[PDB]
Amino acid sequence: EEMPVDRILEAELAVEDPVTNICQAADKQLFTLVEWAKRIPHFSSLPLDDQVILLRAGWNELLIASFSHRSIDVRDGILLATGLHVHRNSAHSAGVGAIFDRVLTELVSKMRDMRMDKTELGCLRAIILFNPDAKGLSNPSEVEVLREKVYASLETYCKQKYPEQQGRFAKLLLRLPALRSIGLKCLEHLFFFKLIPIDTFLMEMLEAHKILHRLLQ
Amino acid sequence: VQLTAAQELMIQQLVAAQLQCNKRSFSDQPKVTPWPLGADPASGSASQQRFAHFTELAIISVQEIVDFAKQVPGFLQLGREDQIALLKASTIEIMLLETARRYNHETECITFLKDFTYSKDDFHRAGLQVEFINPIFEFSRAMRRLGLDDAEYALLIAINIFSADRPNVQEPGRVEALQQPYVEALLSYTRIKRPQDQLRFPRMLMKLVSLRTLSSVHSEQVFALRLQDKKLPPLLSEIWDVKILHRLLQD
Numbered sequence: 001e002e003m004p005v006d007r008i009l010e011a012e013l014a015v016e017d018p019v020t021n022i023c024q025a026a027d028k029q030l031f032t033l034v035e036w037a038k039r040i041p042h043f044s045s046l047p048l049d050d051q052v053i054l055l056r057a058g059w060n061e062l063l064i065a066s067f068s069h070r071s072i073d074v075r076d077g078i079l080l081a082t083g084l085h086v087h088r089n090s091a092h093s094a095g096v097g098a099i100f101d102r103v104l105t106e107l108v109s110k111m112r113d114m115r116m117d118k119t120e121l122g123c124l125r126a127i128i129l130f131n132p133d134a135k136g137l138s139n140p141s142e143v144e145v146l147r148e149k150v151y152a153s154l155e156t157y158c159k160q161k162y163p164e165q166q167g168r169f170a171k172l173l174l175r176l177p178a179l180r181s182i183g184l185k186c187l188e189h190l191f192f193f194k195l196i197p198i199d200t201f202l203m204e205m206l207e208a209h210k211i212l213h214r215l216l217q
Numbered sequence: 218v219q220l221t222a223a224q225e226l227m228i229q230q231l232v233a234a235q236l237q238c239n240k241r242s243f244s245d246q247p248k249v250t251p252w253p254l255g256a257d258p259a260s261g262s263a264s265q266q267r268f269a270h271f272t273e274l275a276i277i278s279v280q281e282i283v284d285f286a287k288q289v290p291g292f293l294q295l296g297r298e299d300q301i302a303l304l305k306a307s308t309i310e311i312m313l314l315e316t317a318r319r320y321n322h323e324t325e326c327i328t329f330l331k332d333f334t335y336s337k338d339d340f341h342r343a344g345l346q347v348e349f350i351n352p353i354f355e356f357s358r359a360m361r362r363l364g365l366d367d368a369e370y371a372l373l374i375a376i377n378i379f380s381a382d383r384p385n386v387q388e389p390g391r392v393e394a395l396q397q398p399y400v401e402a403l404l405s406y407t408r409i410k411r412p413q414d415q416l417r418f419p420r421m422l423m424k425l426v427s428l429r430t431l432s433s434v435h436s437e438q439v440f441a442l443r444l445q446d447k448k449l450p451p452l453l454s455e456i457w458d459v460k461i462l463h464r465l466l467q468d
């Protein structure tokens with residue numbers, strides 16, 4: 001494959017008060033996320049301004065996807081990269097309970113019940129990353145083509161590792177709309193935190209970009 | 218690999234359901250406040266008219282959409298509050314699919330009902346903002362590029378309706394269960410229609426993702442309407458948070 005799922009799996013493995021703790025874990029992971037993106041096939045071949053754009057457009061859904069999968073074996077909560085847990089009760093006391101439940105229902109639970117493996121996650125995240133609809137892109141077709149290769153690698157993987165599950169490929173993709181809506185709603189909360197104990201890279205990501213550029217060079 | 222008889226017939230049912238619904242919506246063409254012609258009078262009332270016109274078109278869409286859902290196998294076998302939760306969330310999305318379906322790349326125009334043709338700028342004259350109008354036409358273009366036929370559209374619309382992650386859905390397990398045969402059918406149909414083009418299916422599913430964003434952009438449009446004191450009719454206010462819908466189902 002020109003988008004080999006092995007290389008994508010390598011990239012996921014190569015990276016191993018509620019509201020504050022979430023922002024703090026988010027800042028931490030933004031650093032990691034750049035190293036993750038660099039190890040996805042062809043990402044770094046793209047123009048540098050396009051690499052920036054794609055990460056700016058994707059980071060939020062990308063971090064949510066990964067902390068969701070990371071939380072598969074947790075009960076009624078999520079596991080942050082800081083190592084700290086967040087449980088329903090906290091989330092609700094903090095006025096963040098509605099979106100919290102949606103994450104558990106639409107992602108964590110679904111991932112668990114499917115046994116969504118680490119390759120399949122990787123492919124979904126690479127699909128999210130390579131978003132031709134991100135604004136400002138020099139060559140959007142270039143990015144659409146990369147996205148499409150992930151479609152193809154992924155489906156093949158699914159037919160080969162899970163042949164008895166004919167609906168598996170689609171089951172994975174149909175997580176993406178729910179993710180998008182959930183992501184929009186999380187962005188909202190992050191914007192509110194900003195209008196009221198916040199860190200430096202995260203801050204950069206919420207403004208309308210020097211740390212990001214540095215980091216990719 | 219192969220298309221079951223039950224599947225063939227369901228797709229037929231869906232395509233039928235659509236066309237029937239468009240012929241009913243054409244009945245309502247002289248019903249609609251005419252689009253003002255000639256130079257606008259000083260009173261300002263040609264704005265108000267354009268906006269009333271567009272709005273009456275949407276209403277007809279909502280009606281068309283409800284009539285369509287009712288004909289989708291399974292939809293009526295759901296609880297009435299779920300029917301509503303589903304049609305509320307998905308109306309704007311389906312509205313946007315239909316819009317794209319009625320787009321013409323050569324005139325860069327959109328045709329509503331039989332022969333009401335509107336450009337980007339007509340959309341602006343009718344009170345919608347560029348932050349909304351542009352995405353609508355970017356979406357139309359992307360959709361045109363895909364070349365969907367009437368069956369692919371009908372299926373994708375049904376799949377859209379049976380999204381279990383909508384707000385206030387009380388029986389989500391049932392909704393995914395309903396959705397799943399429609400996804401299965403679309404897989405088969407597309408794979409028989411165009412076997413050389415294996416990417417058609419996921420490309421299509423990814424439009425469901427796009428529509429979530431556009432829904433959002435449409436909330437931004439509602440924001441700006443209230444900021445400009447443009448007031449939507451009851452049915453649209455009901456459906457976009459700004460009784461009836463229940464009645465439309467009950468008929």
Ligand SMILES: COc1ncc(F)c(N2Cc3cn(-c4cccc(S(C)(=O)=O)c4)nc3[C@H]2C(C)C)n1
Pocket residue numbers: 242268271272274275277278281312313315316328329330435438439
């Ligand atoms: C922000 O929400 C909003 N506010 C005011 C509007 F006038 C509006 N319209 C006016 C309209 C007509 N339709 C519409 C769509 C398919 C088919 C038809 S039909 C039945 O006349 O062919 C109308 N959809 C809309 C929506 C929008 C997506 C352009 N939307």
